[PDB]
């Protein structure tokens, strides 16, 4: 007995669990970005639900009040640095209509896809998780990185990992040693 280490859960199961429209919508915006399960979308939906409650909390009260000004600007700054808002939408009313899609357009696999050298995003997810894509002097195996609008320029392949230069195989060395006898 020392002290309770704080854990919290990031996902949330939808209220009515069989619904043609929701199932259609979720499979679509899972098939677009090449996700593994529906909890990916439930998590992004939970994160946006936390932001929206934090937004309404700061909105309902007085305007030009230090609490609204400080916490509002902190959130907007954090979101515009993620890339979920752009330069010209920093009003704390744009944030309230933020479309989980926008967060899903900023995962590492989506960025690896959209910056080329990725060939269909299911290759981009398997690339990342196979220790290939390093942001900059730093590998990332997480296909839910949330790229932060300054690593967009520096993101590339690792110094290691062929796609890179250092490592030439693990299967190529095999084929080299097998075709060495001719």
């Amino acid at each position: 007995p020392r002290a309770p280490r704080t854990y919290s859960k990031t996902y949330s199961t939808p209220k009515r669990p069989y619904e043609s429209s929701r199932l259609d919508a979720e499979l679509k915006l899972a098939g677009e970005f090449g996700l593994k399960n529906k909890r990916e979308i439930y998590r992004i939906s939970f994160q946006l639900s936390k932001i929206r409650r934090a937004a309404r909390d700061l909105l309902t009260r007085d305007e030009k009040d230090p609490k609204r000004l400080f916490e509002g600007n902190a959130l907007i700054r954090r979101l515009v640095r993620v890339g979920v808002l752009s330069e010209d939408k920093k009003k704390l009313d744009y944030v309230l209509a933020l479309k989980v899609e926008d967060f899903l357009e900023r995962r590492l696999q989506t960025q690896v896809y959209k910056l080329g050298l990725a060939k269909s995003v299911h290759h981009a997810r398997v690339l990342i998780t196979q220790r290939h894509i390093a942001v900059g002097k730093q590998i990332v195996n997480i296909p839910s990185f949330m790229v932060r609008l300054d690593s967009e320029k520096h993101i590339d392949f690792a110094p290691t990992s062929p796609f890179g230069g250092a490592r030439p195989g693990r299967v190529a060395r095999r084929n080299a040693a097998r075709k060495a006898e001719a």
């Binding site: 390093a134 590998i139 290691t160 250092a166």
Partner: protein, 134 residues
């Protein structure tokens, strides 16, 4: 080749413990885990001190590799090293020998045993012998 480059950042000078306390910052590229023995060797040159007078620990190769981050102590002399360095570190460096004493459960057993015999139990060892003729 590798050409491993070391950087001793966040230096605090400590004249109390006769120390240079710093964060060792190693680059590995094309190898990893540069052998704390070799680290002390090539850290002896940066402070022209004897390699028995420098101590490093907790290197922890970073995720993806190519880099390690340890904490490194340099002493003014080896006599000071032995005075202030804990014995476990001194045996890792091979200067002091680890006292190979009895297992803690045997030590706790025999102190609980010696709780009973009052004083030097010689006059009790002179009964256990002389009560065998009854």
């Amino acid at each position: 080749s590798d050409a491993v480059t070391i950087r001793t950042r966040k230096v605090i000078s400590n004249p109390l413990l006769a120390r240079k306390q710093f964060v060792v910052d190693v680059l590995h590229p094309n190898r990893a885990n540069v052998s704390k023995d070799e680290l002390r060797e090539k850290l002896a040159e940066v402070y022209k001190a004897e390699k028995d007078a420098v101590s490093v620990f907790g290197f922890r190769t970073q995720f993806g590799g190519g880099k390690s981050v340890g904490f490194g102590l340099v002493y003014n002399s080896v006599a000071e090293a032995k005075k202030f360095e804990p014995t476990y570190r001194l045996v890792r460096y091979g200067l002091a020998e680890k006292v190979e004493k009895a297992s803690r459960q045997q030590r706790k057993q025999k102190k609980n045993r010696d709780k009973k015999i009052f004083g030097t139990g010689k006059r009790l060892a002179k009964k256990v012998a002389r009560r065998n003729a009854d």
